[PDB]
mmCIF file with all atom_site columns, C-alpha atoms in Angstrom:
data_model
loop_
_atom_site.group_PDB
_atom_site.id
_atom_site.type_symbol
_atom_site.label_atom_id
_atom_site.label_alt_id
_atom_site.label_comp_id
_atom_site.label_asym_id
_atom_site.label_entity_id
_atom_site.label_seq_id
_atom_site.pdbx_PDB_ins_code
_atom_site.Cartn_x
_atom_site.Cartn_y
_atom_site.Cartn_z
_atom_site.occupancy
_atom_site.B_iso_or_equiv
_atom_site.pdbx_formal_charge
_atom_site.auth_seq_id
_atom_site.auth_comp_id
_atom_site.auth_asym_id
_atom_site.auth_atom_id
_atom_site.pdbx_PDB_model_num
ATOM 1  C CA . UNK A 1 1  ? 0.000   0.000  0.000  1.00 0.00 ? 1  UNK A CA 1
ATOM 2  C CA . UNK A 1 2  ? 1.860   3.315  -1.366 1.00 0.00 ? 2  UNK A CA 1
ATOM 3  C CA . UNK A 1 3  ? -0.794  5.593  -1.477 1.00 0.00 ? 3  UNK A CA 1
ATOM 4  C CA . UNK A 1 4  ? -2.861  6.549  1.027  1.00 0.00 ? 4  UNK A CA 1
ATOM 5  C CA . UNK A 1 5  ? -6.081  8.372  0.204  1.00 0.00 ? 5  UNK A CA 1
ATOM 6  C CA . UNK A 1 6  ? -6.580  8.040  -3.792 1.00 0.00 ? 6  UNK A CA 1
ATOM 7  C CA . UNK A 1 7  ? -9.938  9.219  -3.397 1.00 0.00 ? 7  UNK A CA 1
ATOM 8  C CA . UNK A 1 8  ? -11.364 5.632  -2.624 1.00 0.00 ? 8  UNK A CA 1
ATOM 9  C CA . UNK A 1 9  ? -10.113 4.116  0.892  1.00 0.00 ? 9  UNK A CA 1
ATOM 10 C CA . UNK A 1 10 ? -12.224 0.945  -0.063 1.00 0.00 ? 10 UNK A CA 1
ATOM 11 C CA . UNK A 1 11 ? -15.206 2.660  1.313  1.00 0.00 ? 11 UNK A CA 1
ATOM 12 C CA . UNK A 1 12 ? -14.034 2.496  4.885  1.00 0.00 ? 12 UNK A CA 1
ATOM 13 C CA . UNK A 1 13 ? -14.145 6.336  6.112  1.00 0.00 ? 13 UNK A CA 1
ATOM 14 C CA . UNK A 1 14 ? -16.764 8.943  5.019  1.00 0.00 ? 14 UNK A CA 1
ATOM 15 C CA . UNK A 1 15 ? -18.962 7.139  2.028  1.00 0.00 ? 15 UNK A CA 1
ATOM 16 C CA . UNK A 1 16 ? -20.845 10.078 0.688  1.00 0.00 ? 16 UNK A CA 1
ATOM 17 C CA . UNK A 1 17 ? -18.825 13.155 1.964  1.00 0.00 ? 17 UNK A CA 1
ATOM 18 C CA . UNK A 1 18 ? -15.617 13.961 -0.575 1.00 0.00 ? 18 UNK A CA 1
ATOM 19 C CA . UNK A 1 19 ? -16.512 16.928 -2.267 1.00 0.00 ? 19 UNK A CA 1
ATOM 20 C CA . UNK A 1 20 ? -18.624 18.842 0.248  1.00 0.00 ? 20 UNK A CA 1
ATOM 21 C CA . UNK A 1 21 ? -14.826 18.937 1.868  1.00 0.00 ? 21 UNK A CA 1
ATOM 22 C CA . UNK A 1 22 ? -13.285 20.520 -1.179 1.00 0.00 ? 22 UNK A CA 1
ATOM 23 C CA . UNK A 1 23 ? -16.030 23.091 -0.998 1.00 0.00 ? 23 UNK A CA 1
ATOM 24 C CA . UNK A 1 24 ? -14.406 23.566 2.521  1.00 0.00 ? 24 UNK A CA 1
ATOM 25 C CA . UNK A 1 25 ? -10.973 24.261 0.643  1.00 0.00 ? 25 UNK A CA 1
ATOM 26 C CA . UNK A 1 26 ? -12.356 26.523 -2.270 1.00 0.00 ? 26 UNK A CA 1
ATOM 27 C CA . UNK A 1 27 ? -14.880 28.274 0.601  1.00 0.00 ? 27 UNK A CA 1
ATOM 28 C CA . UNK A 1 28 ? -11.892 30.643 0.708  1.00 0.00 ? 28 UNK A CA 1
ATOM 29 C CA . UNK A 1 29 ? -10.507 30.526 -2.932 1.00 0.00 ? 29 UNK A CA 1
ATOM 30 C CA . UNK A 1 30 ? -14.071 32.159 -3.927 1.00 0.00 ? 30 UNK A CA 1
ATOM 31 C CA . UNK A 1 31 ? -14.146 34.629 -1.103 1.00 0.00 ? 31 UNK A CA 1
ATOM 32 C CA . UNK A 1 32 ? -11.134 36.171 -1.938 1.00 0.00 ? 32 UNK A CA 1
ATOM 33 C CA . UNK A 1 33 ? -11.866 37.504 -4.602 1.00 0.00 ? 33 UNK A CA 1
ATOM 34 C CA . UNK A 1 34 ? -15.172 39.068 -4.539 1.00 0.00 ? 34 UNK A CA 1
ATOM 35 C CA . UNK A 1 35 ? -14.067 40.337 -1.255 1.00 0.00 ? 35 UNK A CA 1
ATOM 36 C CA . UNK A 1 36 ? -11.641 38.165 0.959  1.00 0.00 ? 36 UNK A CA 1
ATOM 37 C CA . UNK A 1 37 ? -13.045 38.395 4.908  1.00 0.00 ? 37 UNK A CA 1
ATOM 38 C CA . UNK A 1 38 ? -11.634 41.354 6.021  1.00 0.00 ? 38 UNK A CA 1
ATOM 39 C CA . UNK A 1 39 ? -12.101 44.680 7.412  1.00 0.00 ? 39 UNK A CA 1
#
């Protein structure tokens, strides 16, 4: 086992739940530019 999390662990952590954490990582990367948080 090289790899570690090739976007399928077997099914055996978080079935349904990839993407909704990428939306987590762009949150930010789509805030910034119509206005990053910030005042």
């Amino acid at each position: 086992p090289d790899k570690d999390f090739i976007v399928n662990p077997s099914d055996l952590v978080l079935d349904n739940k990839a993407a909704l954490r990428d939306y987590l990582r762009q949150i930010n990367e789509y805030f910034a530019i119509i206005g990053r948080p910030r005042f």
